[PDB]
Structure formats: structure tokens, C-alpha cells
Write a protein that binds this ligand. Structure first.
Ligand SMILES: [Cl-]
Ligand SMILES: [Cl-]
Ligand SMILES: [Zn+2]
Ligand SMILES: [Zn+2]
Lengths: 361, 360
């Protein structure tokens, strides 16, 4: 595990992480898989898009197919046919979003969203799973507030105690461990949580508990507060969100890594992410269009197909339309991040950010 | 142009030269309906080795309609496919519709999209396929289900419609195939074949079979038909292109085949392998570290285990369907490649015996 910042432009950082299965230049957007797959994409598609790292959740993997089947494959990378790095989410947001869970300091009991059976999860079990999966970056198991101030405070303190326990149970080789800062929209709590986890010591630091509904201005202010107490020589990872204008605002505040289901999910609804903003392929303004999805894109979709043809596929309910937009949208995210990196190297990052924020209102 | 390079019994090794490419035969054509083979890109099709695909035209005529495909300067451009396309004239789709009015002028039916009354006849069909620019067009036919009187009427109508199709077929760089009808009645099959060859087409399809009659009659009617079809032109069995039937039909002189079977059953979780069907949803795959087909070199077999594919289906990931669709088309194109190699090497009966055993 090594991270270096090669150039800074204000708070924006050009860096590189060396992980067990590959180097990752930052800032980086990670495509998200839940069930050991990025929906509608093959690993080839992801490699051709230029993705250097993907995110896997494991809350669902722990349930299905389970640790034992992934051990038979000798890890998640082999199971899903992806030979580059993987970061695994520890599932805090998913678990604590479930109705009628029983939480205490030992852990959480919940009903499986798959089959309804009662499951117990805690830091020691989460580490166990992630060690078995073999991801290049593992996350500590947090108490993510589902919450009033007193609740957020309880979950933040519990997050510290679980961070210690996760770190203690993290006995492996070739895997980094990131801590997760909590604190909701309360700067005192955010500052305290950052100082707490920073005192424990991790390979990198995630900012948890944001882009879950709070106002955007609060998302940005809380990132600034946290980033003030996070070491400059480690990666900063904002969890969730992943809209182009948010990612640019956050890069400008010192964040290095990002993930979202946004680009894959909106592709399936028929929306492309282009350099001109969102393009709704279901709109009738595409029905007779001979233009590609994006004039400035080199992906398979933009090389071969017209807006008219893709509109048609969505009109008829062809899943191929969803596939073609998922390929385009992931290409676009990786290409956005490469543009960001280039702009930081060139000192033109403010020019880029203005153009992105303009079209992603 | 079409040339038989070798025969082994009645099995023919041949080559068609079409506007967008050469096609070696015997050949299986993957089938699309809405200007796509479901879940596949043109790149997947190319990498499978598909030298030609089939497009239905019934639904394309309604959506997006002919004018929008014309904006693209034709169907190959519209769907991003640069190799040959055979277009079906829609006779089986009209056969599959409830409550149509058919006479000598044409067929009226209610739109699958709209409920509105749609009228289709040979002239309209030719105009659509001409606009699409497919490499092979089919005549508009009347496909029956039925009493000899009823089958004979549809077969007679098919002749009159074949004449009208040929007269409306004013184009260039497109072949036109006639369609033999006649149900399960040998005399009607012989007469239909004689009538269509008297007109003269670029190829001859065997229609109205594998739609419910006994297998032994599918095979016998194919023999009767092929007896009256020119050896220097392609023979096309329309539909029903499962592995064991394809092999039985190659052995009786048929060159071209199509079916939605491989793509459709992939979506239900079934792989076509050299050992027969494999149901990936079956619980015995849950821990299997084997590929879908140890004999196969496709993307899917090279990279994933039966455990992972099983899991994708377990979790409702459409990726599971995509991967089995890639494999199943690879399997069908490879099966046909082996058929061709076996005719050349005189080992066709060993291939046949294996296919028949596992696709029983
Ligand atoms: Cl338009
Ligand atoms: Cl589909
Ligand atoms: Zn593109
Ligand atoms: Zn395969």
C-alpha cells in the first residue's frame, strides 16, 4: 500500500495508489457492483473503459453466494473474472437501512433481505468476510446513522469502537484498510470522528454518512470539515453520490476517490452522461437523430450507433439499449476522471470544473 | 452466387456470395426481431464467427418503420451490423397472430403495438425489404397450419404471392428466396417446389414445417421438397433450428437454418454445450468451478465458472443472461463450423451421431 500526491492545484490532488492488483491514479471514480458484477457489464467492458479499480459491496455477497463459495474460487477477483483492484464496502449503509434491526455494542441482528433469516454482523465478521474476499482495499465496519443528533452521536462513538475492533481483527497480507469518518451534519462530531480514526491509524479515510439526503451545501461543508483533519499523505474517499458536479466540487476540496451506482443505474433508465450534460434517449428529440450519444466520446456505443437506434431499443424494451448506455456511461465517468487528472497537471482544473458544473446543474 | 464445394451423401459444403460478404454453408443464422439479436452487440456476433444473421421485418415495419431505417440508409447501418442479413417476410408472425382476415389481395390483422388494423401483401412486403436493404429477401407467403383442402389453398395462394413478390422486386444487390409450402402432403410439396422453381428464385426455403407436425413428417417432407429443388441454389429450412434437427436436415441436403432457441433459452438459464443442454439454475452448479463448456473458447467459458453464472441467475443479474447468450451463439456457430469441417473430412456421420445422442 503506497499513495503519493504528484501535484496539487488548490486543494485538488493528483495522486497514485499502489495496490496488490494494480496502480490506480487519483482522483478516481469506481464503478459499483453489488452482487459481484457491475450490472450489464463484463470485466472486458470495464477494462476497455479504462477502469483501474471497481467497488464491490459484500453485504449481499456475505448472504449470497457466501464466503465459502468465494473461498472455493480463491477470492472475489477470480469469482467475478476481474483481475485489477477491488475495494469492498463493509455494508454499514445497507445494514443500518434495514427495518427492525437490533443494534448494540456487540453488533447488529437483522433479517436477511434475501430470505428473511436472522443474521448477526459485527466488525470481526465483516473483517473475516473481506479477508476471505481478498479485496485490495477493505473498509472497517461502521455504525452508519440511518437520525437525530443524539442518535448520530451514539453511532459516531460506536463507529470509533468498531474501527478499533475491525483493525484488531484485520490479520492478512496485501490488503489496505480504510476507516470511515461519521458525524452526520454536525461539525463537532465530524471533527471528533476524524481525530478519533486518525489516532487509530489507517491506510486511507472515507467520509461516510453524506449524500444520503442532506442539502448539497451541507455535503460540501462537512467534507471540508473532515478533510481538515485527514492526513494529506493518505487517500480521501467520499462514499456514494457520484454525480459529475458533486465529484468536481469534492475534488476541489481534497477528495481522491468516489463511487456511485448513478451512472449504471441511470443508463438503465435511458439517460446518457455526456460532456454536454444528461441526454435522455427516451425523449422524442432522438427519434430521427443520426448523431452518436456523445460527439467527443470514443466508446463502442458512440462509434457504432445513432441516438435514433438507441431511442428505438428503449421504445421496444430491448435490454441492449440499457447495455449500450451502461457502456457509454462508465466510459464517460472514467474519461471525466482522466480529464480531471489532466487539468490538475495543467493547472486548468478551474476551467474544467466550470464547464462540468455548467452542464450538470 | 452459390457454389457447392463438396458433398458427403446429401450433405453439402457450399459458399454464398452476398452483397456484404461471403457465407459458408451449412450455416445457422442468429435471429433478431427489433433490429437486434437480444442482449448481443454486433461485436459479440462477429467474435462468435457469425457470417450472417436473420432479421424479422413484421415488427420493424411498425416500429421504427421504414422511413427511419431509410434515414440510416438501411438496416445494416441502423443496427451497426456490416455483414449479410436475411430478412423474413413475416409469414410465420402473421400465422402466429390471432384473428386475421386473409384472401388473395393480402392479410389484414390488428397491430401488436396499437390494436389498429394493418394490411400486408406481397407488394408491401417487397417494398419494406427493399428499404431495409437486406442481402436476402423472402417472398411473402401464406403459411397454413389442417385438412388437405385448406393446405392446398394456402399453397396455391403462396404461388400467386410468389409471382407478385418477384414482380414487385425491383432492386439491386439483393437476392430473393421463394418459399415452398404444402403441409404434410407430399403431392402438394412436390407441386409447390415445381411451381416456385418454374418462377425462378435465388434460393428456396422450405416453409410450414416444425410448427407442430410429427418429427418424422418434418423429415420426410424435407426429403420430398429437396428432390424438386435445384442443387446449384441454397436450401433454407425456416425455423426450428435445434441441434439434432439441423443435423438431420443437413443430412437431407439443407444448407441454411435459423432459430430464436439459442438466445431465448440462454435467457432462461440454459446453456447449449457439446454435452447437451446444461441448466445453470440447477443447484448442482452452485459450487462448480468448471466452465459452462470445457470444449468452448468463448468469452464466457474462458473467464467464469458455473458457480458464478448460477449465482448471477440466483440474484437476477441480467449479466447471467448476457453471458449464456454469448456462449449459446458461439456454440451454434461452432456446431456449424464443425458440420462443414466434417463434410470436408468425411467424418459427418460421427458428428451427427454425437449431436443426436446429446440433443435427443
Ligand atoms: Cl430527432
Ligand atoms: Cl431484450
Ligand atoms: Zn460513448
Ligand atoms: Zn462458451
Amino acid at each position: 500500500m503506497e499513495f503519493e500526491v504528484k501535484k496539487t492545484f488548490g486543494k485538488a490532488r493528483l495522486g497514485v495508489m499502489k495496490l496488490h492488483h494494480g496502480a490506480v491514479e487519483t482522483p478516481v471514480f469506481m464503478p459499483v457492483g453489488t452482487n459481484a458484477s457491475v450490472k450489464l457489464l463484463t470485466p472486458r467492458d470495464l477494462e476497455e473503459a479504462g477502469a483501474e479499480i471497481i467497488l464491490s459491496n459484500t453485504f449481499h455477497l456475505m448472504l449470497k453466494p457466501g464466503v465459502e463459495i468465494i473461498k472455493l474460487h480463491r477470492g472475489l477477483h477470480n469469482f467475478m473474472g476481474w483481475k485489477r483492484p477491488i475495494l469492498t464496502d463493509s455494508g454499514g449503509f445497507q445494514v443500518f437501512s434495514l427495518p427492525k434491526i437490533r443494534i448494540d455494542d456487540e453488533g447488529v441482528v437483522f433479517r436477511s433481505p434475501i430470505d428473511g433469516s436472522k443474521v448477526f454482523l459485527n466488525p470481526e465478521i465483516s473483517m473475516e468476510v473481506q479477508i476471505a474476499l481478498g479485496s485490495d482495499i477493505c473498509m472497517v465496519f461502521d455504525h452508519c446513522p440511518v437520525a437525530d443528533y443524539e442518535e448520530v452521536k451514539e453511532a459516531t462513538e460506536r463507529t470509533y469502537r468498531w474501527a478499533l475492533r475491525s483493525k484488531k481483527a484485520f490479520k492478512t497480507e496485501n490488503q489496505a484498510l480504510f476507516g470511515i469518518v461519521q458525524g452526520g451534519i454536525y461539525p463537532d462530531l465530524r471533527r471528533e470522528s476524524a481525530l478519533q480514526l486518525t489516532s487509530i491509524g489507517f491506510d486511507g479515510y472515507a467520509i461516510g454518512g453524506l449524500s444520503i439526503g442532506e442539502e448539497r451545501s451541507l455535503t460540501l461543508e462537512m467534507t471540508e470539515v473532515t478533510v481538515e483533519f485527514l492526513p494529506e499523505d493518505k487517500p480521501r474517499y467520499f462514499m456514494g453520490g457520484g454525480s459529475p458536479e458533486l465529484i468536481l466540487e469534492l475534488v476541489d476540496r481534497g477528495v481522491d476517490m468516489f463511487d456511485s451506482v448513478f451512472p449504471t443505474r441511470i443508463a438503465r433508465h435511458g439517460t446518457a452522461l455526456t460532456w454536454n450534460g444528461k441526454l435522455n434517449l427516451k425523449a422524442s428529440y432522438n427519434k430521427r437523430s443520426l448523431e452518436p450519444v456523445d460527439e467527443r466520446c470514443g466508446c463502442y456505443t458512440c462509434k457504432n450507433f445513432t441516438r435514433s437506434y438507441i431511442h428505438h431499443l428503449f421504445d421496444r424494451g430491448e435490454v441492449l439499449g440499457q447495455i449500450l448506455l451502461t457502456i457509454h456511461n462508465i466510459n464517460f465517468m472514467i474519461s471525466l476522471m482522466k480529464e480531471v487528472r489532466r487539468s490538475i497537471e495543467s493547472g486548468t482544473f478551474k476551467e474544467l470544473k466550470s464547464k462540468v458544473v455548467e452542464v450538470y446543474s
